[PDB]
Amino acid sequence: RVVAHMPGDIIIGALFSVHHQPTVDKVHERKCGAVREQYGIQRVEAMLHTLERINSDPTLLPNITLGCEIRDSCWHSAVALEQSIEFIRDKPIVGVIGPGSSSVAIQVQNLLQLFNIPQIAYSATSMDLSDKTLFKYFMRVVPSDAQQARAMVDIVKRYNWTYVSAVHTEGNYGESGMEAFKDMSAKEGISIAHSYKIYSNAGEQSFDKLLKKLTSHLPKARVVACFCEGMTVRGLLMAMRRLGLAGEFLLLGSDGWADRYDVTDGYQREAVGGITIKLQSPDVKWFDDYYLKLRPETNHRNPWFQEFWQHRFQCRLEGKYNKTCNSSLTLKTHHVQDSKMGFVINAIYSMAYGLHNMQMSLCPGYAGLCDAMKPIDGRKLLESLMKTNFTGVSGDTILFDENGDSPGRYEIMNFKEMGKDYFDYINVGSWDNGELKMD
Amino acid sequence: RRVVAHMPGDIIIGALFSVHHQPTVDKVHERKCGAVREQYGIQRVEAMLHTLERINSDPTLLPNITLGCEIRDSCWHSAVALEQSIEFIRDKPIVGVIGPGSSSVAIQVQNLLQLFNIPQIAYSATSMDLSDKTLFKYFMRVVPSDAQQARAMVDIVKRYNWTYVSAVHTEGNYGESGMEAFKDMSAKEGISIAHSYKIYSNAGEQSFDKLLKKLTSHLPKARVVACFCEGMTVRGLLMAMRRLGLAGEFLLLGSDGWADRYDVTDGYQREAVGGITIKLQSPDVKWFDDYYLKLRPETNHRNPWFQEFWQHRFQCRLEGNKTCNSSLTLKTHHVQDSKMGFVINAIYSMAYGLHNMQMSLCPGYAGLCDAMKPIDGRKLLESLMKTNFTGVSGDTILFDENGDSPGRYEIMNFKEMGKDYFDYINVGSWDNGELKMD
Numbered sequence: 108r109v110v111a112h113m114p115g116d117i118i119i120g121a122l123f124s125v126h127h128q129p130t131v132d133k134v135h136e137r138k139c140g141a142v143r144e145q146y147g148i149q150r151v152e153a154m155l156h157t158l159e160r161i162n163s164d165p166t167l168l169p170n171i172t173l174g175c176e177i178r179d180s181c182w183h184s185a186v187a188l189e190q191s192i193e194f195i196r197d198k199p200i201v202g203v204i205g206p207g208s209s210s211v212a213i214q215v216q217n218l219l220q221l222f223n224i225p226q227i228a229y230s231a232t233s234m235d236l237s238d239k240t241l242f243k244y245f246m247r248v249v250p251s252d253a254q255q256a257r258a259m260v261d262i263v264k265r266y267n268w269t270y271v272s273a274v275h276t277e278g279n280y281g282e283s284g285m286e287a288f289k290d291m292s293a294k295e296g297i298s299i300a301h302s303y304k305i306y307s308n309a310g311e312q313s314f315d316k317l318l319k320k321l322t323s324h325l326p327k328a329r330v331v332a333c334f335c336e337g338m339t340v341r342g343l344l345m346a347m348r349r350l351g352l353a354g355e356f357l358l359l360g361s362d363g364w365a366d367r368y369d370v371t372d373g374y375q376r377e378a379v380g381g382i383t384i385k386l387q388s389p390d391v392k393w394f395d396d397y398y399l400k401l402r403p404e405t406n407h408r409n410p411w412f413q414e415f416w417q418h419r420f421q422c423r424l425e426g427k428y429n430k431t432c433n434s435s436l437t438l439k440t441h442h443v444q445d446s447k448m449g450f451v452i453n454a455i456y457s458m459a460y461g462l463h464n465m466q467m468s469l470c471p472g473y474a475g476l477c478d479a480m481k482p483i484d485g486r487k488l489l490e491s492l493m494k495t496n497f498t499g500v501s502g503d504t505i506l507f508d509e510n511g512d513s514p515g516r517y518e519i520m521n522f523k524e525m526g527k528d529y530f531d532y533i534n535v536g537s538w539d540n541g542e543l544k545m546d
Numbered sequence: 547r548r549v550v551a552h553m554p555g556d557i558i559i560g561a562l563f564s565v566h567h568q569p570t571v572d573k574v575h576e577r578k579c580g581a582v583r584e585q586y587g588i589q590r591v592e593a594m595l596h597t598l599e600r601i602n603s604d605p606t607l608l609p610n611i612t613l614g615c616e617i618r619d620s621c622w623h624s625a626v627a628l629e630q631s632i633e634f635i636r637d638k639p640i641v642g643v644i645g646p647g648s649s650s651v652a653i654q655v656q657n658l659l660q661l662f663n664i665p666q667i668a669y670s671a672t673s674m675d676l677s678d679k680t681l682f683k684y685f686m687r688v689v690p691s692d693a694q695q696a697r698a699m700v701d702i703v704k705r706y707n708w709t710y711v712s713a714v715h716t717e718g719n720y721g722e723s724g725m726e727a728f729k730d731m732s733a734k735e736g737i738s739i740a741h742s743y744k745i746y747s748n749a750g751e752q753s754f755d756k757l758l759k760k761l762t763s764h765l766p767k768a769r770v771v772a773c774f775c776e777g778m779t780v781r782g783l784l785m786a787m788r789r790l791g792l793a794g795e796f797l798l799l800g801s802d803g804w805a806d807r808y809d810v811t812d813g814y815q816r817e818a819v820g821g822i823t824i825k826l827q828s829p830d831v832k833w834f835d836d837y838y839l840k841l842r843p844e845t846n847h848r849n850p851w852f853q854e855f856w857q858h859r860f861q862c863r864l865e866g867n868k869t870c871n872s873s874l875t876l877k878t879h880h881v882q883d884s885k886m887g888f889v890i891n892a893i894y895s896m897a898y899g900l901h902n903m904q905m906s907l908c909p910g911y912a913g914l915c916d917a918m919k920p921i922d923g924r925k926l927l928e929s930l931m932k933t934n935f936t937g938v939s940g941d942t943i944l945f946d947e948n949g950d951s952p953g954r955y956e957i958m959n960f961k962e963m964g965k966d967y968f969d970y971i972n973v974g975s976w977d978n979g980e981l982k983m984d
């Protein structure tokens with residue numbers, strides 16, 4: 108399997124979903140699907156460039172250069188574990204950024220903790236991961252769904268819904284979030300018509316059946332609480348197309364969906380009215396400058412880039428598509444920054460600041476790695492990381508609590524019709540530390 | 547480093563048994579385990595060792611090939627089990643794995659083993675989840691999935707015309723998957739569940755207290771309590787019943803975690819009295835006791851845990867506070883592990899898979915030939931998925947498409963057989979849909 112290498116005195120690992128998860132037919136081979144941009148190439152590229160900026164910043168880790176080993180998770184548990192094994196055999200991997208998904212992160216954490224390797228996630232939101240007896244070497248730069256689910260329960264109350272349906276994605280994210288939503292909503296007098304679950308990669312038939320099952324609760328249960336992966340919502344949408352059910356349901360979705368266009372593209376009419384929750388994360392300015400200048404002929408250090416470029420533009424590079432890649436192709440056309448970019452970048456910084464701090468205490472008057480950090484002791488790195496206190500890429504303070512969690516907040520999107528045949532995500536409200544505010 | 551039981555051979559098979567109890571909150575992070583276990587540890591270790599000896603002595607099965615083993619301690623814990631499982635894969639190669647016992651532990655081990663093409667055969671992991679061959683391709687078992695045990699438990703509730711029961715399951719894949727099967731089966735059968743609860747087996751005294759208090763508030767409408775539970779969870783409850791004195795007000799309908807296990811009820815019998823349990827049908831293995839009971843701490847070094855076990859079992863110290871008398875013997879208070887036959891069938895399955903492979907790849911030869919050097923794990927899987935032989939008790943062992951085996955349950959009753967005497971009474975049976983009591 109392909110890997111992205113950056114040399115250094117210290118090597119940080121990372122798992123990003125450079126390709127989609129395998130299909131039912133190629134699962135056991137663990138042959139992954141198509142190359143991903145926002146969730147893959149962009150995060151890979153973020154990783155490499157953040158490391159450059161840190162290595163160029165003399166305030167942070169002076170005379171030490173951070174290198175990395177970036178690996179493909181395919182958003183899949185087998186693939187991520189396989190790849191995590193490559194991290195632990197046995198120059199060492201000091202800590203790992205990612206992976207994206209709660210149940211995948213858990214599987215990864217189960218391996219890493221046996222090797223005292225701190226792991227810092229940027230999108231794994233499940234409450235389960237707050238348990239430090241079970242997941243001691245796991246931390247994250249996002250809040251847990253104790254709050255997200257709370258926000259979803261609060262949106263239901265605000266709009267005066269007492270009767271809803273529930274769908275969650277199979278696996279720890281959906282399962283655990285929906286548990287929280289089911290519990291909170293029962294105390295607050297909200298009835299759940301039925302709770303359904305489905306895997307994001309189920310066939311059209313499974314989704315069709317789920318859609319028919321949801322119609323049986325019409326007209327009372329037209330709102331569907333979806334603690335769902337983006338690809339589960341898309342499945343629901345496409346099933347609505349096949350069954351001609353556009354305008355029957357209002358989907359209330361969690362962060363798997365947020366403001367993701369790949370979820371709704373091609374299926375806007377069936378999604379319109381949708382309410383989604385997004386974790387507050389501003390664009391990082393300096394990412395686009397770097398990224399939109401990248402060229403397939405000279406971006407060798409990212410070994411998936413040529414594959415991605417050819418996919419994006421549907422062309423062959425003069426280094427199977429029916430055309431050749433034009434010289435004037437640029438990413439600035441239709442560019443959309445990954446909604447979680449700031450989290451990725453902040454996760455990478457936590458690791459660096461964790462390392463820098465350790466260095467200051469264990470190497471008090473020395474420049475670089477002194478014997479006491481040769482080699483780095485994971486248990487002390489975790490102590491250092493657990494006391495994370497810094498200013499983020501976007502100017503917020505990033506701090507960890509005793510559970511390895513981080514404060515955050517949410518934007519509430521409505522997916523609106525903005526005029527004939529044109530739809531978009533519109534910020535309509537927010538949720539922060541218990542307070543819902545709508546426009 | 548962790549202690550291992552070794553036996554040499556041309557083909558090495560791995561095994562996972564809970565030789566010690568799980569970490570006690572909190573020796574958890576250091577992964578230090580607790581007290582040594584007899585039925586679930588030492589006896590299984592011993593069955594593994596002796597079964598291989600018996601196979602190596604049988605000339606109809608793998609002639610000229612010596613089967614060895616690497617037997618490791620799981621402590622019935624996901625982290626320890628995974629930790630030990632890495633020792634199997636780094637990198638003589640381990641060809642197959644027997645165990646571990648618990649479903650969520652077996653899941654963790656299967657996720658690693660599938661990556662290295664190493665077949666896994668379980669003796670006691672019963673969760674429906676494990677039937678999914680897309681997630682768990684390299685996993686098989688010699689016991690039926692809890693699809694049947696759940697259905698059986700529902701049928702027991704109906705048999706006594708109960709319409710309102712409480713539910714408790716052990717945190718983990720076994721309890722959660724089995725209770726879900728039970729809830730989505732009883733709701734259709736018109737049975738109501740007052741409240742569903744859950745708990746870790748290693749949860750403190752304080753934790754079980756809270757649970758029981760909650761259960762007491764569910765009374766007196768729900769005295770019957772469906773427990774898709776590990777034995778220690780059941781024990782946990784009984785110990786909480788003692789601390790409160792709520793004994794004789796609950797009826798516990800337990801799954802195979804409890805079954806006919808004395809280590810669950812020992813010391814808390816009157817708290818348990820009345821209880822009903824489901825046990826997988828597994829007859830005692832005659833030859834096992836013959837071999838086992840003859841073992842001596844001075845002469846049984848191949849089992850590295852045995853001296854620890856001997857010393858713990860008899861509360862004495864061996865010569866190389868009180869000194870161990872030479873008269874001590876296991877024949878006293880001996881109880882054979884209830885799932886013993888399943889361990890033994892699992893090993894024989896591995897053995898038979900290896901043998902069938904050997905006949906097609908090494909046709910006119912006795913022994914490991916070049917074409918099985920090394921052993922293709924994908925081919926071992928192929929061969930084991932065609933498992934069909936006659937078991938130690940005499941039944942036919944056969945894997946379905948999902949790598950599952952057929953089985954059946956006995957229904958136990960825990961009751962007083964006179965002033966201060968209590969025992970498990972075989973009160974019925976369940977077999978392929980049909981429940982029978984008398």
Ligand SMILES: *[C@@H]1O[C@H](CO)[C@@H](O)[C@H](O)[C@H]1NC(C)=O
Nearest residue numbers: 494495496497504505506507
């Ligand atoms: C770090 O964060 C804490 C909050 O826990 C704050 O009190 C402190 O002022 C911050 N940083 C420094 C450098 O003092």
Ligand SMILES: *[C@@H]1O[C@H](CO)[C@@H](O)[C@H](O)[C@H]1NC(C)=O
Nearest residue numbers: 932933934935936942943944
């Ligand atoms: C299993 O094998 C025995 C003997 O080889 C044979 O008689 C029997 O029909 C087989 N059964 C199945 C279901 O394969």
Ligand SMILES: N[C@@H](CCC(=O)O)C(=O)O
Nearest residue numbers: 208209230231232280363
């Ligand atoms: N927060 C989700 C992932 C959502 C996403 O980034 O698409 C999880 O914990 O698995």
Ligand SMILES: N[C@@H](CCC(=O)O)C(=O)O
Nearest residue numbers: 648649670671672720803
């Ligand atoms: N059947 C339980 C284990 C019960 C036991 O053997 O104690 C499981 O699959 O996890």
Ligand SMILES: [Mg+2]
Nearest residue numbers: 161162167168
């Ligand atoms: Mg620097």
Ligand SMILES: [Mg+2]
Nearest residue numbers: 601602607608
């Ligand atoms: Mg032989």
Ligand SMILES: [Mg+2]
Nearest residue numbers: 686948949950
């Ligand atoms: Mg199976």
